[PDB]
Each structure stands twice: as structure tokens, then as C-alpha cells.
Amino acid sequence: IQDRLGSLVGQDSGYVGGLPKNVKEKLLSLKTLQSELFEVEKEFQVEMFELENKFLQKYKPIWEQRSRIISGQEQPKPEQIAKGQEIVESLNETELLVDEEEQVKGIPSFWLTALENLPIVCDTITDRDAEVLEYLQDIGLEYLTDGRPGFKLLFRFDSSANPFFTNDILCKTYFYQKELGYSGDFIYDHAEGCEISWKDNAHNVTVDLEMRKQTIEKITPIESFFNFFDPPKIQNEDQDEELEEDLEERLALDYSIGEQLKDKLIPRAVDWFTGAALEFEFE
Amino acid sequence: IQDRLGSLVGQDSGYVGGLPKNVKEKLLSLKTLQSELFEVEKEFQVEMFELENKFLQKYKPIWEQRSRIISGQEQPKPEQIAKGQEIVESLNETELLVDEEEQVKGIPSFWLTALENLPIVCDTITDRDAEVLEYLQDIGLEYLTDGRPGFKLLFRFDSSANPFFTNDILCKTYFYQKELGYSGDFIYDHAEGCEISWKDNAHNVTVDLEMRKQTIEKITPIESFFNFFDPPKIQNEDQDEELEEDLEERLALDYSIGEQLKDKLIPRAVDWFTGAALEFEFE
């Protein structure tokens, strides 16, 4: 509240300011003991990040399974099919129930549909790029072990049928800073955008093509979802205004989005498709 | 927003409702694959809770050290004393600086002072019980390994000088439910209050004593901080109103508080004393 810290921290920093040499000293050492804790808390975070990658491994198999179901590449074993009905009824998701258990292949626009129902990331998609997101085959995680910690998002596309770009995978990379938060956990530092190979300038969803004659073309940067693969410029000399406040919050959102896919979308993709996810959260 | 889920989840649960038998089925299995993930995610939480207890161990030593510094039981080694000054300047906490490094013993009302500057928990303290909190020697953590997971808060008091109660330690116990959240982590379930042995009915801060004659005394339950050691009644048949909404949020706060001590106060007690903590967070 800018004030609840100008007045509060004020008297506080004052009270302490007035304490005896004697007492003051004790705190000085307490402040030292704090930095010791800190050194431990760093190791903690390390074994945690590891422990996490450990289970990412145990999930991958499952997520790949669904990747294939959605692809239409693998079919549902009746056994699974039933359990789902049982589960779905249990969760009162009746819209999913189907009669006497045993058209299209797999489940169309799963990722497009799921992302629509996802907060912040639905406002980045445009009809223009929603067409391109038709070809999004799966989205995956990967923690950066070798080197500075961070994670990565892997958008595997239908290379063999994708009209806009020949790429097989587009990823996103986030790097936390070595320094830990006061809170005690990793802090966002830098983000890298796994470039895109649009076959056509026209097919380039991130840009606008209006051709004139003097049939030369004029290109114009559009606001697209695929701009996610071109994070905001590496930290600039803060100081200034719109050269900061502006290109600074574009980043804040970019970090926020990546965290949504990493924490909600990927772990519960089915539900984000059904919209069930949205609710399951308020509950 | 109650509506952004009545209209949203509505069309969503509808779209899905209209999908083909074919497609519907796929999701039914996806829904099955989800419950598999779930079984893994439980193990994850387990190795995590463990990993956490592992480091709690590595912290204990340090925290005990400060416990003693605050007690006045152990003195600050000049080496620590300096580092603190170095640290404090570095963090621009000048009020802590003291001149030529080498009255009262240790550092008085450390825990009382720290708790004051702590959100929600400062509103529970009353002049009445702030006197009793003068004797609070330390506050500690402990994860429940043997059995259902949860944690515990250990308030060690100055038994040898405490006027109000003879107890050596008052604790608080929180038990998470075996079932995990949709979010993926532990959920609050039940809270236990480590009883208090007030020497005097008068000294009983949690109650009010107004003696009349007919010199018999009349007792009246006051709103105290030490009520924290008598959590809200074990889950009652929800249904009703103030017998619910009322004694339900008294709980919500009680769980919230315990999480504040566990996550902020204990890990950064020095700062909560200086008030530095408050700020270090907005930053």
C-alpha cells in the first residue's frame, strides 16, 4: 500500500534504530545466522528441483499416452473407456458419459480448445492464429538440469500437415536467476524464444501482409499468440519510461503465461478442454 | 465470479456434451489417464514432504542458535557480530549498524515484537496477552512423519519465570487430509490445540474474571491470542448457518495464521522483529 510500509516500516526501522548497543549487536548476529539458513535453503531448492525432474519423468509416459490418444494415433482400450465413465459420473461430469461402450480421428482442436479456456493465454490467440493452433499436437515440460535452473515448453506440431510452418517443435525457455528469492524460491530471470520457420510471408501469423504497387509487399508486426516465441528484449537499462514500464509488463505477462501452461494446462489438459478445470479450481 | 463459471463452464460443459460418441470416448480415457497421473502425484508429494523434513533438520541447529541468542543464554561471537554489520549495510538496514564492535540480557520481547509486525496474528494479541507473550522463548516447526502428514508449532516458554502458566511448551497441530488437492498439494483437514495450564483463574488470559458476592467468581470467555491453542470444534454437520459460516471462517483464519508462522515468521524471525520482513516481501 506504499504507505503501510512508509509509516509501518518507518516506526519499525525506528524502534530497532533506538535499541541498545548491546541488543543491536545480538540482531547483527541474528542477521548473520539468517545468511547461513540461506545457504542451506539454496541446497534445499536444488534437491527439490531435482526431485521434481524425477517425477516429470514418471509423468512423461502418461502424458505421451494422451498425446497419442489426441493424435488419433492410439485408440482407447475399452478398459480405460469404462473407468472414464465411472470417474466422470463420480465427478458429476455427465456431459462426458456415453452409452453402451464399444467419424473423426482422435480428438480435434484439443490443444486449441484447452488453451481457449485457459486464462491469460486465450487473449493471445486470434482467429488468425487459432487456425495454426489447429495443428498443435502436444505441449510438454522439461526442467533445465545441466546449467542454470529453469524450464522449457515444447509445442510439438503436425509438421507433416502444418500449412504455416515446417517446424516440428517450437519451445520456450525460462531461466531462473541463481540468486534465490527472499521468499525462498527461484526467481524469473530471462526467457528465450524458440524461433519459427513460416513457409510463407502470408502464412506468417505474427505479421500483416498488405501488398501495393509503384506488386511489392509491406510487412507489419501484428499482435499474435506466436509472439510467445519471441519474448521481450533482454533486460534493458531500466531507468526510463515506456522503454521500461511498457516493455517490462509485456514480460510479466509472458512469464505468467508460461507458468499457467507449466502448472495448470499441462498437468490437467483434459479438464482445460472440458472447462471442468476452471471450476475444479474454485472448488 | 459465480457467473464466469455459470455461463463459462456452462457452454464448455455443453460443447463437450455435444461431441461425438467417438470423440467423447477418447476423453473418457483421457479422464482415466488423469487418475493415473494422480496416483504418481501422490508419491511425489510424499518424497517432497520427506525432503522437507530433511532440511528442517538442517535448519533446527541454526534456529536453536538464535533461540539461545534471544534467550541471552548464548552470546554473539565477534566474528558473527561483524558479518552482521556487513550484511546489514549491504541490505541498507542502517538502523542495525553499531560502532566500534566490542544492560539487558539477550533481546527482550523478540517473539512478541516479531509477532506484532506479522500480519493476521497481530490482531489476535491483546495487551492482556502481550504480557504473557513476553515469556515466549521460541517458536518451532515439525512435520508429522509417523502417520497422516501435517505439521506442528512449538511455543517454548520461560517455564521458570512465566507468571501465567507452568507449561514448558504449547504446540499447535495441523493435519492435512490424505486426499490431495486438485491443485496437487496437501489440503487442510483438522487442527489440534495443545492445552494450557494457567496457574490462576485470574492469570487466565483467555477468560475474564469479575467476582461478585451474594465473593464467588463469574468467568467469561474473552477473545485472546492463546485461543490459538483451542482450534474451532471438529467439523460439524455443515448445512446450517452461523453454526457454519461463522465457526467455519474462525477456522479459515486459524489455518491461515499457522501457515504465516510456519512460512514467514519462523524462517525469517529476525526480519519480522525489525519489520524489515514486511518490506523485503513487496520487493
UniProtKB/Swiss-Prot annotation, chains A, B:
Q: Which GO terms describe its biological process?
A: budding cell bud growth; NLS-bearing protein import into nucleus; nucleosome assembly; nucleosome disassembly; positive regulation of microtubule polymerization; positive regulation of transcription elongation by RNA polymerase II; protein localization to cell division site after cytokinesis; ribosomal small subunit biogenesis
**DNA-binding keyword on record:** yes
Please list the residues that carry the modification Phosphoserine: S7, S13, S29, S35, S71, S90
Region (Interaction with NBA1): which ranges? Answer: 74-275
- What post-translational modification does the entry describe? Phosphorylation by CK2 is required for normal progression through S phase. CK2 phosphorylation is not required for correct bud formation nor histone binding.
Q: Which GO terms describe its molecular function?
A: chromatin binding; cyclin binding; DNA binding; enzyme activator activity; histone binding; identical protein binding; unfolded protein binding
Quaternary structure, per UniProt, is: Component of the GIN4 complex composed of at least BNI5, CDC3, CDC10, CDC11, CDC12, GIN4, NAP1 and SHS1 which forms a ring at the bud neck. Homodimer (in-vitro). Interacts with the B-type cyclin CLB2. Interacts with 60S ribosomal protein L18 (RPL18A or RPL18B), CKA2, CKI1, eukaryotic elongation factor 1 complex eEF1A (TEF1 or TEF2), FOL1, HSC82, HTA2, HTB2, HTZ1, KAP114, KCC4, NIS1, SSA1, SSA2, SSB1, SSC1, SHM1, SIP5 and TCO89. Interacts with NBA1. Interacts with histone H3/H4 heterodimers.
Domain comment from the record reads as follows: The acidic domains are probably involved in the interaction with histones.
Q: What is this protein called?
A: Nucleosome assembly protein
Q: Which residues of the full protein are shown?
A: 70 to 370 of 417
